Amino acid sequence: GLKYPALIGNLVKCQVELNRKVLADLAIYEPKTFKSLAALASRRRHEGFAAALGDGKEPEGIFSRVVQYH
Amino acid sequence: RGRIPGRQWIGKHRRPRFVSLRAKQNMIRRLEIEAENHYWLSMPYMTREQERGHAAVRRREAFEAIKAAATSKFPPHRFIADQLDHLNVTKKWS
Amino acid sequence: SKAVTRHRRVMHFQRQKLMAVTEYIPPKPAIHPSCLPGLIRLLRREIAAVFQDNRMIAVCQNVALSAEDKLLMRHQLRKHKILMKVFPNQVLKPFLEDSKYQ
Amino acid sequence: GYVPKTSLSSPPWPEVVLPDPVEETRHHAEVVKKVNEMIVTGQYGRLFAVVHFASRQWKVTSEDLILIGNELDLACGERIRLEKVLLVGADNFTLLGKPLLGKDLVRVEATVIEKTESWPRIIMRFRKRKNFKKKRIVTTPQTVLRINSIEIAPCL
Amino acid sequence: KFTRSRIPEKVFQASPEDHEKYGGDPQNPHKLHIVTRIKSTRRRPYWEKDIIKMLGLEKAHTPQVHKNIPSVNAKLKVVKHLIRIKPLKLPQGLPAEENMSNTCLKSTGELVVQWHLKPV
Amino acid sequence: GGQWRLQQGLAANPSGYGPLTELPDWSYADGRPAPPMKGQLRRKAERETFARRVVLLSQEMDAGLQAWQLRQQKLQEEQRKQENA
RNA sequence: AAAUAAGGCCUACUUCACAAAGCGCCUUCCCCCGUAAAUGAUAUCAUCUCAACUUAGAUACCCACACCCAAGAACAGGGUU
RNA sequence: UAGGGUUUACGACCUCGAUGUUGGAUCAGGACAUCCCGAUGGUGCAGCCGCUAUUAAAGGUUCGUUUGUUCAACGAUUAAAG
RNA sequence: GAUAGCUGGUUGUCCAAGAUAGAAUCUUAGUUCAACUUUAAAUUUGCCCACAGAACCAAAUCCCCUUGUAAAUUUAACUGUUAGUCCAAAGAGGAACAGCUCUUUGGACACUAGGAAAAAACCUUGUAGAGAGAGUAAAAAAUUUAACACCCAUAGUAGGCCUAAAAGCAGCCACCAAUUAAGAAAGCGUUCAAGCUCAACACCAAAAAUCCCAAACAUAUAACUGAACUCCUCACACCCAAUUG
Ligand SMILES: [Mg+2]
Ligand SMILES: [Mg+2]
Ligand SMILES: [Mg+2]
Ligand SMILES: [Mg+2]
Ligand SMILES: [Mg+2]
Ligand SMILES: [Mg+2]
Ligand SMILES: [Mg+2]
Ligand SMILES: [Mg+2]
Ligand SMILES: [Mg+2]
Ligand SMILES: [Mg+2]
Ligand SMILES: [Mg+2]
Ligand SMILES: [Mg+2]
Ligand SMILES: [Mg+2]
Ligand SMILES: [Mg+2]
Ligand SMILES: [Mg+2]
């Protein structure tokens, strides 16, 4: 119940870098893993939409907020 | 049925090419980057008058190094070690 | 081909792209204002004079009478002392309501 | 600014709403504690990890083979510890970093079996009437790896 | 005849609106730029190719730093349509003798001297 | 693809000076650190050369500014001296 | 009633004969979009509809060895009481 | 202002270590800027004979005298010898 | 074994550099010089350079210090190129036509890569290998003009000049003004007048011949896909015609 562009965008918007080969392998031999990934992608999409609509103040998405590095 | 003259990209008549949204967005972002570069290129720091000889020493040193490397152009040396080791092609055992 | 031609020369790809990107973009009214909010003095003076001099004024609906019929009516009204009048209604309604003639 | 219900008054997609942050964090902590207890009880079976080695993400599980197209300079028969894992799990639970996971959380044990070469690959180039005919043979190096097991700790 | 395209003086004149839009400022301006070729040298005149070769931008998408002086300014403007320019602002002091092995460029021009591999 | 990475400043390409590539790939089972890779050493040398060039350019600019200031001061002193006598 | 093009035949007529052919004889059937008209609004007139609705507005052949042949180069087909 | 490459040229782009040159015979495929068989509007339409504009190509498009010439003159036909 | 500016061909592996302004020639299908290119070597300045400097009858161009750089002059060799095509601008003749003939400035093609359908010349992009990796440059045509505010007509009269006649329109003049409130008349039709409206008042773009040619949807949240371009593990001399080393 998702699309490839939005799914890839939501997966990239979570610091969860995963190539396409591993994604296909999981979808083939691990339906539950891909289901959880799709759920996380939909949650990130909804959080981003809510943020763009209300500009946050001050949730900033429980799943968003990338981990900074130095 | 659409018969047109030879070669569609030259001549008096050519197939009319139309622009899409991809090329439009590409040109827009390119113009934005160009305007950013223009803005960044509008604030000098030395005003020319302050750069009448602040690094000529480095240029002279680099030129001297290049000249020394060029003048060093000479054939290699020679040694008897290789000429004597070449005789080992007939190395014999007991 | 030459520079100037009788027909419209096909512009280059980059030229057409620049011409299309540099098009005119008019403003976008967020609300659009389309969905937002002499002789008459002489007429009034004459109507006031008539109202002041209307000792015995009458009203009819003369319209079906031809020009010759109107001329005959004017002749009859000139025989016996009496005059006719023809004034508008747009300028007469305000004075009508103001003269307490409900 | 009321809008009567029409075919375009509201968007077509369902307007969902997210829960509060306090309850969300509470549920997150509860699920984390549940997963920690499940891991401590030893309920998992046959773990799998996505090891990003040799610039490639391999869906590693257990007792599987991997062949890399380069040299690592390691004597055949030595244990190796891989890192950069970012997708560990098994059944009824999963784990993934942001991106990489903690070192003390995952431990991938691997070994070396052999260091062979690739089959004789042929290179060739040709053109039209340009007398262009180039040939070359290449035999890049290869290796073999075997992941013994994938341990896990309750570090959460 | 396609001659050497020149640029007038009214172009390079930052206005208050431009300064407000970007982060740069007139007083105390940057001293170095972050040149990064984003366009190939082909399909361009020969003088532009020579300028690109002199600037040292053979491999595209590669960072490069040059002096912010009138000469280098004009040299950059000559190919402005083929390179990306950005200021090199150092949050901390310049790289000392001790801060030369652990460094990083980082996007948006931010040369960090304490480059580590751990989360905040 | 994901251009959003540039908004946060974590390299447009995920394989760019990030923790997914700079971090050592493998390591000895006993915990010993594996030797550095050739690509990592090349990137380190490139960064060192870049920093050296930046420092050299900054020092050259500072020296030029100081020389210009000294020349201006010398010209002012010469003018002041010529004003007398 | 005659021809045109197509589908058949030798019993009368001919070239002629144990046949075939025409000069000789039989048959050939469905409307085609271009217009003119009820009823009313944008345009309470009027008005044929790039508004809603009504007028001139597929039938045909078929799908169980060996001798002769009107069937056929062979192959194949029809008959062999 | 739009469509034509069917006439005269214009350019020589592969085809001079070969594409055999016009008419006339059998066979005709296609397009309508439609001569005729079907249907309409107007008309200097009292009717035929006429003229104009749209659709319809399912069909038809003769027999002969001359010049080698498609073209070029003439005798008789059918609604027509495009 | 004639000659021949001429047709044809001129044998194994791999690396690198490698496209020319013109002149003469019983000559433009051929030759030389010049110019481009290659090898070994001695020398130092080669290019964008900044104020300025460079004519009476527009893009521009020459010299040009700091500044990016590492390229340039010469010596001694000698083969190879010296018929070009397309694109943007100045053009020249032609028809302000030709895949039409010739120059000036830049790019491409003769050299691979990803697209515009099959394309040399159009857009993007070059240092050369592997991996079953990641990020990007160029990249998908849009669009339907025609009604209309359609209520309603006395008269000084056929004003005067010519017009046997045009009185309101064969031609010229002033164009007043009574109707309660508006044309010596703005069209239509009259030989000529007769009749019909109007100005104003009272609500008021397509067609050529074998047969049209990628299926196809206006309504799930802007971002994806997309190279031999950049990066990831290793080592790198291993993608130009002729010619050369
Ligand atoms: Mg063609
Ligand atoms: Mg030719
Ligand atoms: Mg020939
Ligand atoms: Mg020949
Ligand atoms: Mg031949
Ligand atoms: Mg027609
Ligand atoms: Mg000979
Ligand atoms: Mg000769
Ligand atoms: Mg030949
Ligand atoms: Mg031989
Ligand atoms: Mg080469
Ligand atoms: Mg002579
Ligand atoms: Mg020519
Ligand atoms: Mg080529
Ligand atoms: Mg490369």
* CA nearest neighbour of D110 among D39, D51, D42, D45: D51
Residues ending a continuous segment of chain C before a break (C–N > 2.5 Å): 37
Cis amide leading into A58 (omega within 30)? yes
Q: Do B33 and E84 touch (CB under 8 A)?
A: yes
Tokens of D121: 């690959």
Q: Do chains E and A touch (3 or more CB pairs under 8 A)?
A: yes
Experimental method of this PDB entry: cryo-EM
Cross-chain CB nearest to C20 (options B12, B24, B31)? B24
DSSP for chain F? --TTHHHHTS-SSTTSSSTTTSS-SEEETTSPPPPPPHHHHHHHHHHHHHHHHHHHHHHHHHHHHHHHHHHHHHHHHHHHHHH--
Cβ atoms of residues D120 and D148 within 8 Å: no
Instruction: Please indicate if any CB of chain A lies within 8 Å of the CB of D22.
Output: no
Q: Do A13 and F19 touch (CB under 8 A)?
A: no
Task: Please state, in angstroms and rounded to a whole number, the distance separating the CA atoms of residues D152 and D45.
Answer: 11
The residue written with tokens 């900054």 in the block is F58
Report the DSSP pairing between strands D48-53 and D133-138. unpaired
D148 alpha carbon to ligand 7 midpoint, in Å?
80
**Which residue type is seen at E55?**
L
Cβ atoms of residues A16 and D96 within 8 Å: yes
Q: Do F67 and B54 touch (CB under 8 A)?
A: yes
Task: Please state, in angstroms and rounded to a whole number, the distance separating the CA atoms of residues B9 and B17.
Answer: 10
Residues F64-73: contacts with CB within 8 Å, 24+ apart? F64/B46, F64/B50, F64/B51, F64/B54, F64/B55, F65/B46, F65/B50, F65/B54, F67/B53, F67/B54, F68/B49, F68/B50, F68/B52, F68/B54
For residue D51, the cross-strand partners are D58
Specify which residue's alpha carbon is closest to the C1' of nucleotide I15.
D134
Task: Please state, in angstroms and rounded to a whole number, the distance separating the CA atoms of residues D142 and D120.
Answer: 12
Q: Kindly report the CA angle at E94 between E88 and E96, in degrees rounded to 5?
A: 145
Cβ atoms of residues F12 and F3 within 8 Å: yes
CA dist list (Å): D37 to D31, D152, F4: 10, 13, 37
Task: Please state, in angstroms and rounded to a whole number, the distance separating the CA atoms of residues B10 and C10.
Answer: 10
DSSP label of E104: B
Instruction: Give the phi and the psi of residue A30 in degrees, each rounded to 5.
Output: -155, 80
The residue written with tokens 């079976």 in the block is D45
Cβ atoms of residues D16 and A45 within 8 Å: no
Tokens of E50: 């020579």
Task: Please state, in angstroms and rounded to a whole number, the distance separating the CA atoms of residues D22 and A10.
Answer: 24
Rounded to the nearest 10 degrees, the angle between the axes of helix A31-54 and helix A20-29 is 120
Report the DSSP pairing between strands D65-66 and D145-152. antiparallel
User: Mapping DSSP to helix (H, G, I), strand (E, B) and coil, where does residue B66 land?
Assistant: helix
Round to a whole number and report the distance in Å from the CA of F83 to the C1' of I50: 32
CA dist list (Å): A66 to A8, A13, F5, F10: 16, 8, 10, 10
Q: With 0-12 CB in 10 A as exposed, 13-18 as middle and 19+ as buried, what is E49?
A: middle
Left if phi > 0, otherwise alpha if psi is -120 to 50, otherwise beta: which for C18?
Answer: alpha
Cβ atoms of residues E113 and B74 within 8 Å: no
Cβ atoms of residues C91 and C43 within 8 Å: yes
The helix (H) or strand (E) run that includes residue E57 is none
Task: Please state, in angstroms and rounded to a whole number, the distance separating the CA atoms of residues A66 and F8.
Answer: 8
**Between residues 67 and 86 of chain D, which touch chain F (CB distance below 8 Å)?**
72-73, 78-84
Give, as ranges, the nucleotides of chain H with any atom within 7 Å of a protein CB.
1-2
3-state DSSP percent of chain C in helix, strand and coil, to 5: 45, 0, 55
* CA nearest neighbour of A69 among F49, E34, B86, E118: E118
State the virtual CA torsion across E90, E94, E97, E102 in degrees, nearest 10.
0
Task: Please state, in angstroms and rounded to a whole number, the distance separating the CA atoms of residues D148 and D109.
Answer: 5
Task: Please state, in angstroms and rounded to a whole number, the distance separating the CA atoms of residues E34 and D3.
Answer: 52
Q: Do chains A and F touch (3 or more CB pairs under 8 A)?
A: yes
3-state DSSP percent of chain E in helix, strand and coil, to 5: 20, 10, 65
The residue written with tokens 């569609």 in the block is B8
* F39 Cα to chain D: minimum distance (Å): 12
Task: Please state, in angstroms and rounded to a whole number, the distance separating the CA atoms of residues D144 and D115.
Answer: 6
**Residues 6 or more apart from D52 whose CB is under 8 A from it?**
D58, D84, D85, D86, F20
Task: Please state, in angstroms and rounded to a whole number, the distance separating the CA atoms of residues F70 and F77.
Answer: 10
Instruction: Please indicate if any CB of chain B lies within 8 Å of the CB of C25.
Output: no
Cβ atoms of residues D111 and D77 within 8 Å: yes
Q: Is the CB of C6 under 7 A from strand H?
A: yes
Cβ atoms of residues A14 and D98 within 8 Å: yes
Task: Please state, in angstroms and rounded to a whole number, the distance separating the CA atoms of residues A8 and A3.
Answer: 9
Instruction: Please indicate if any CB of chain C lies within 8 Å of the CB of B35.
Output: no
**Residues 6 or more apart from B31 whose CB is under 8 A from it?**
C21
Task: Please state, in angstroms and rounded to a whole number, the distance separating the CA atoms of residues A31 and D46.
Answer: 16
Instruction: Please indicate if any CB of chain B lies within 8 Å of the CB of E39.
Output: no
Rounded to the nearest 10 degrees, the angle between the axes of helix E70-77 and helix E46-55 is 130
Instruction: Please indicate if any CB of chain F lies within 8 Å of the CB of B48.
Output: no
Tokens of E48: 């532009």
Residues F50-54: contacts with CB within 8 Å, 24+ apart? F50/E63, F50/E65, F50/E103, F50/E105, F51/E95, F51/E99, F51/E100, F51/E103, F51/E111, F52/E100, F53/E65, F54/E32, F54/E65, F54/E88, F54/E94, F54/E95, F54/E111
**Which residue type is seen at F62?**
D
* CA nearest neighbour of E64 among E49, E74, E53: E53
Task: Please state, in angstroms and rounded to a whole number, the distance separating the CA atoms of residues F7 and E83.
Answer: 21
Residues ending a continuous segment of chain D before a break (C–N > 2.5 Å): none
Resolution of the deposited coordinates, in angstroms?
A: 3.9
Task: Please state, in angstroms and rounded to a whole number, the distance separating the CA atoms of residues C52 and C44.
Answer: 12
User: Mapping DSSP to helix (H, G, I), strand (E, B) and coil, where does residue D9 land?
Assistant: coil
Task: Please state, in angstroms and rounded to a whole number, the distance separating the CA atoms of residues B46 and F71.
Answer: 15
**Which residue type is seen at F49?**
T
Task: Please state, in angstroms and rounded to a whole number, the distance separating the CA atoms of residues E36 and E57.
Answer: 7
- List the alpha helices (DSSP H) in chain A: 4-12, 20-29, 31-54
CA dist list (Å): B65 to B55, B71, F42: 16, 10, 26
The residue written with tokens 């020389």 in the block is F67
* CA nearest neighbour of C15 among A64, F27, E119, B19: B19
**Which residue type is seen at E34?**
I
Specify which residue's alpha carbon is closest to the C1' of nucleotide I94.
C2
Residue E76 CB coordination number (10 Å):
20
Cross-chain CB nearest to E95 (options F9, F51, F61)? F51
Q: How far apart are the first and last CA of chain F?
A: 77
Tokens of F54: 């930046």
Instruction: Give the phi and the psi of residue A41 in degrees, each rounded to 5.
Output: -65, -45
